[PDB]
Design a protein around this ligand. Structure first.
Ligand SMILES: O=C(O)[C@H](O)[C@@H](O)[C@H](O)[C@H](O)CO
Ligand SMILES: O=C(O)[C@H](O)[C@@H](O)[C@H](O)[C@H](O)CO
Ligand SMILES: O=C1O[C@H](CO)[C@@H](O)[C@H](O)[C@H]1O
Ligand SMILES: O=C1O[C@H](CO)[C@@H](O)[C@H](O)[C@H]1O
Ligand SMILES: [Cl-]
Ligand SMILES: [Cl-]
Lengths: 785, 785
């Protein structure tokens, strides 16, 4: 079974084998943890760069998670063994490592915690994980209950494997003074500069108990012996051996021996995490490790998640959509803007898009993000590939490879901010540049961004692609300095059209004329060189070849040029239906729209690394949700309401059981992709990446608020412009906007020709609610033809 | 049980649980594989840089092996499941992954192959691995025999897990045309330059069958299902499902179904390895995958190992020493010089020391190695930190961190070469430098090396240490440009004394006077600033502090300054007994002599990274065998025969059972270390690193040939100068030298005062055999007081 519980606070899965990859996540200001239904987990924390405290059993590469992450028996996780001392029989919660037959199993994804209920051998177990807001520590609560009529003698053993911490130095032992196990390493390095760099690293891992245990074991190999994780030797004997680890792989295992009466339940608390030293661990113990510590953390964490609850609650005829939108969507948006994916150098397009989502959650965060981002703009007007969030941080990984699209996001996302808040006054704020002494207004920075995009174009009027644009691994189209991007061109025209509107709203008319004419010029160049007859091509290589065309067998059509040609005006009314039909014929699937098709099956070295990913995975033809939502936003922009909704709704798994089993994910987030290459590899199509980091969600939330429900801000107030799917005879939404609340009721009427809007029961003229008082609630009735 | 078999060709272990870390190795011109007794293996190959074909189940760091490598259930390995189709019962060879009760178990380390015999359920299994000389491929031979009286119906399943190959792209399927499983990936990267760099990578892994199987499975998860490795789901059912891997972790599993008659045995062959493409895999199949292919490979491989058999066969009263020396030592030496540890940039001291060992195996390799190394000498005279073996290779890892000792090895190791071969004419060969146009003789290059060492010294006359000397991680003594090394000083005096002797032998008398006076000057500076009263200190920091002294609590005495002070003459006859007693009191252990003591337990940042390794591991106070053998060589140099032998013999585990169990290794190699910190952590002391890469063995072989057996070359012929331990009443050695053979018999006589030597039964005067004819055999009798 799989369903929402607890009035939407949690989502419960009742089989540990039907959806074995399914997972949920938690975060806080400094860490995140992905937890698998069976007990495996991946946890990363910032200090201020990424690090971990629970390691693989080998030397792992520097990495958080892969799409479609595989697990394996020794993968890090969070486990408890229960042993009936009368019979010798054992089981483990949550399910791994023993995989015993259970009488009951529930995995509860929560907004603020992750929990399990399980039962075996007549013993009922509850396990609950949560995080505090501000510190790096896992709070664990274990309940064990004798559900039968006679007393039962049990051994209970937390098993929190620490793994292979370091080839240079790793160890562990029991600390009575800290009250638990302390594992210790030195992070490996060879350069003397790294010694100075690494000085404040939290290289100890603690596992601390509230309740003193009977015994402990810190040596992984001694724990398992010949029995392995299935039947550890240390658990077969009466008492743990109390061994340490001396340049041996450490582990955190405790043992409690209890005789429980009929119906008796006992509670045990633990904290697990990194520390610089034992004094930091004790500080966390004092702060957290108690009933009062746990309550106080949970109450503060609940407040934090509520502060990000967003601005739209819906009640539609689709209860799966209601649950997702009301409970899970705004939390996933909030994660992105509040902690920026836990990188010190967010990719610029990510930083701007994720903060765009915050417009609908905590717009002051958005405001500050524009100011921060623009302070790092180059004197030329160009934006850097990443935004540094800390003094001393550096550009890393893809951020070191020159991409060209970073400026385009500024007006695209600023538009959402200005529509929602009406904070035009942000345009007047003064910000420096990355170098030099110039300090200029936001508005002047934006002008320079748009002049950059106009100047970064070849003699045909098309934008240079260098080693990529929005498609990160599209790196061989323009690496020799001549290749251009189809997508970046049509997006630049959108960006310039939007910014020109803003300039007109601010009386900057020379700017409005310049950027409008730039957009026309680009669109004309697109129509002359990129349009391929039935859709727009993707780019032109360094050697003058147009790809993403009907003459290409693989990569015959890309989604993005089509969406953005719609948005930016390259696609006129005659071209639009060609676009729609080509997308439906070649890209639409039951799991959503693919970003390209057919997927590449071998390297094409005038396009690049994208073509080397497995066909159907990530940018190589997956249902890449962020590309799909740009298409949805484009469809909304031309009133293609039914097509927009159908494709948006495909992004949410369920309720169809085969769909749920095939995607393999809980419906508590949208992943960065569902596997594509639907025609070429149908067996795997739809499978979830399980990756909760995606810029998709800020756009999905925008599309629902402004597009589908049609409750959009303007300089006059709230514009009512719904595009509800025609199947809904009635719907409701509650919209928080500019400090007020709107209780909106939508209803289809036989007796009207045009939409009718009533405010507090009287008919308005026009479609804008203009008198909005902070703290007030308004009743809106929207009758639709 | 644990003993030599097959007239010394193999070494057999008969328990899979008593020594669970024990392993042996195989290599060839392009690869090496470490195989664990239980079936785990680590394999690396050169293409021309290091790579692998069997991967961990996660994203692993770029690495071969760690000291004291831990295993875990999903670690790469080489397995076969056997299923009784009548009962459902299963077991696996060699032992993992099922860990069933066996009726018989043997693990056979071989000079040329690795094999197992096991029995369970009345079925007898043999498994044999070998490599060819020149290609990268594992040759596997499986025999299955019904040992009972009735027919038996079995399923037999090779399980060669491929692991997680790549986040970008991984897959696998069955290829009828190749005749087996082909797994395929693209090695991940992001920089366009890496695409061009990676073009010839062997990114497919094959598992090819000689005999067509009933079924196959290429999806790891489908193979295991809920049963895991213990009881795979795919093996529970009647037939494998024949599934593929599509951006899923691949595996190589086949299924054979057989009814075997009473006493019937069947043989099955497979090859496993990397390939660029299916055409390369088929090429390997045609070449190797047959009875004739396997025989031809084995016969050619046996010839290759015999070509490296070395120059000394012994028959002493210690049969453990005989076995090691005769069978295992020369093979380990040969590996080092023949393939240079499978790095394209050997550390200079390693390249020179390993090739020194080749003096006794294939001296023309040594000769060529001096010429190659010197061609990369800098115009200053300094030697680079590594030696590049291929055009386009680069310095990597420690080779990028400035160390200062590289020149000292040249005369130290050249001496062994000249004594063994008498090839003084090498000195006249002309070689360029790393830059510039100068081409000069070997002899002139050497002069410039020794002038470098003289000039790289501070105002006190002591050698600069920069970021390390022989002790690789000793990086904070001199990183600010002032710190000096105690060891490098006393070694430089040795090197200069040796080279001066050579110059005198060549009539270069001005050179001999200059280098001799340099040595005296250094030794005087050592005695004034480094001698600490009872032993020599290790160095002086950038801020003027002498460490490795009686005032230091940790790192109170280092071994190396003492050995090399003996060799280079800083230690006079009054100091020597202080050295010996300090080493015995503070450094000697039952497992050998520690390199420093007590081990460091925390960072000391004017000494550096060495102090951060776990106490007892590697350079932080282990029995670091290469330091120990320098001390043994120093003891031989002053006729401390009993102490030299006792410490050399401690490097070989066994026959004491507690010793064997505690070190945890087969006696078929010397590891780079046995765990130290004997006083501080006695539980783990003696544990083998299991690392067969070590410069120890060229020195151990030298010490035995020239020192203990005392059969040493000179410009006059063979000098007879044995230092046998006094317990041996008789011994024999057969020595190959300058193309002749010497059958030497040693015997203790009551009736003489001085050694007496007879050649072909007549007494000689003096101790040199001077008339040596190539192809002749000489009988030598050495009577000793
Ligand atoms: O192929 C790649 O280079 C990676 O997929 C990137 O596109 C990353 O996913 C991105 O930097 C977010 O981490
Ligand atoms: O601590 C370290 O830097 C490593 O131990 C080195 O000393 C390597 O072992 C050496 O480069 C051989 O690989
Ligand atoms: O993973 C990603 O993929 C996207 C497609 O390459 C890119 O636009 C985002 O900035 C990046 O986070
Ligand atoms: O691992 C090593 O350790 C030694 C000690 O640091 C060093 O001298 C060798 O060159 C190096 O191979
Ligand atoms: Cl794209
Ligand atoms: Cl040393």
């Amino acid at each position: 079974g799989l369903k929402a519980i607890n009035n939407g606070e949690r989502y419960q899965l009742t089989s540990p084998t039907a959806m074995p990859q399914s997972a949920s996540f938690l975060w806080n200001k400094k860490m995140m943890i992905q937890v698998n239904c069976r007990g495996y987990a991946v946890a990363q924390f910032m200090q201020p760069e990424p690090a971990k405290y629970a390691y693989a059993p080998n030397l792992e590469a520097k990495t958080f998670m892969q799409p479609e992450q595989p697990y394996y028996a020794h993968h890090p996780g969070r486990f408890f063994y229960i042993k009936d001392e009368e019979t010798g029989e054992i089981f483990s919660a949550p399910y791994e490592p023993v995989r015993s037959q259970l009488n009951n199993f529930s995995f509860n994804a929560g907004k603020s915690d992750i929990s399990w209920h399980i039962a075996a051998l007549g013993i009922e177990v509850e396990l609950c994980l949560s995080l505090p807001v501000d510190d790096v520590v896992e709070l664990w609560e274990l309940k064990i209950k004798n559900g039968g009529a006679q007393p039962r003698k049990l051994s209970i053993y937390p098993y929190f494997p620490v793994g292979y911490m370091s080839w240079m130095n790793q160890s562990g032992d029991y600390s009575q003074t800290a009250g638990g196990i302390i594992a210790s390493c030195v992070t490996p390095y060879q350069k003397v500069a790294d010694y100075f760099k690494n000085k404040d690293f939290k290289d100890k891992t603690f596992f601390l108990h509230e309740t003193a245990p009977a015994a402990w074991e810190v040596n992984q190999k001694n724990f398992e012996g010949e029995g392995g994780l299935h039947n550890p030797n240390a658990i077969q004997q009466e008492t743990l051996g109390c061994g340490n680890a001396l340049y041996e792989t450490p582990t955190a295992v405790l043992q409690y021996r209890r005789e429980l009466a009929a119906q008796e339940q006992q509670t045990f608390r633990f904290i697990f995490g990194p520390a610089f030293d034992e004094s930091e661990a004790i500080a966390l113990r004092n702060k957290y490790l108690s009933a009062e510590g746990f309550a106080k953390a949970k109450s503060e964490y609940q407040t934090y998640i509520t502060s990000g609850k967003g601005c739209l609650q819906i009640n539609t005829p689709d209860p799966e959509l209601n649950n997702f939108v009301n409970h899970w969507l705004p939390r996933q948006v909030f994660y992105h803007g509040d902690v920026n994916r836990l990188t010190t150098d967010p990719q610029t397009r990510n930083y701007i898009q994720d903060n765009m989502g915050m417009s609908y959650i905590k717009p002051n965060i958005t405001r500050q993000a524009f100011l921060h981002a623009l302070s790092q703009q180059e004197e030329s007007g160009a934006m850097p590939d990443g935004i540094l969030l800390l003094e001393g941080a550096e550009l890393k990984y893809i951020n070191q490879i020159p991409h060209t699209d970073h400026c385009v996001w500024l007006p695209v996302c600023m538009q959402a901010y200005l529509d929602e808040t009406n904070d035009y006054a942000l345009l007047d704020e003064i910000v420096p540049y990355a170098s030099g002494e110039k300090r200029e207004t936001v508005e002047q920075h934006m002008h320079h961004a748009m002049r950059w995009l106009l100047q970064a174009r070849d003699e045909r009027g098309l934008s240079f692609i260098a080693q990529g644009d929005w498609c990160d691994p599209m790196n061989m189209v323009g690496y020799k300095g001549k290749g251009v991007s189809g997508w970046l061109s049509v997006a630049t025209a959108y960006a310039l059209n939007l910014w020109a509107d803003v300039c007109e709203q601010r009386q900057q008319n020379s700017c409005a004329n310049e950027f409008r004419q730039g957009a026309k010029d680009i669109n004309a160049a697109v129509n002359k060189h990129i349009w391929d007859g039935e859709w727009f091509g993707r780019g032109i290589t360094d050697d003058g070849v147009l790809f993403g065309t009907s003459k290409d067998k693989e990569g015959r059509i890309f989604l993005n040029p089509q969406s953005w040609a719609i948005l930016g005006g390259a696609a006129d009314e005659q071209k639009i239906p060609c676009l729609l039909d080509a997308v439906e014929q070649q890209l639409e699937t039951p799991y959503g729209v693919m970003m390209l098709a057919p997927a590449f099956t071998a390297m094409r070295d005038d396009v690049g690394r994208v073509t080397q990913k497995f066909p159907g995975s990530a940018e190589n033809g997956s249902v890449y949700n962020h590309a799909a939502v740009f298409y949805i936003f484009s469809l909304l922009s031309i009133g293609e309401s039914e097509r927009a909704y159908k494709l948006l709704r495909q992004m949410l798994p369920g309720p169809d059981e085969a769909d749920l089993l095939q995607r393999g994910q809980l419906p508590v987030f949208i992943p960065n992709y569902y596997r594509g290459a639907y025609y070429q590899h149908p067996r795997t199509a739809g499978r979830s990446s399980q990756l909760f980091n995606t810029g998709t969600v800020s756009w999905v939330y925008r599309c629902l608020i402004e597009g589908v429900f049609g409750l959009k801000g303007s300089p006059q107030g709230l514009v009512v412009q719904p595009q509800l799917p025609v199947a809904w005879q009635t719907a409701e939404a509650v919209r928080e906007f500019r400090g007020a609340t709107f209780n909106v009721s939508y209803r289809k009427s036989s007796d009207i020709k045009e939409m009718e809007i009533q405010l507090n029961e009287s008919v308005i003229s026009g479609n804008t609610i203009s008198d909005i008082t902070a703290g007030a609630t308004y009743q809106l009735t929207v009758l639709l033809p």
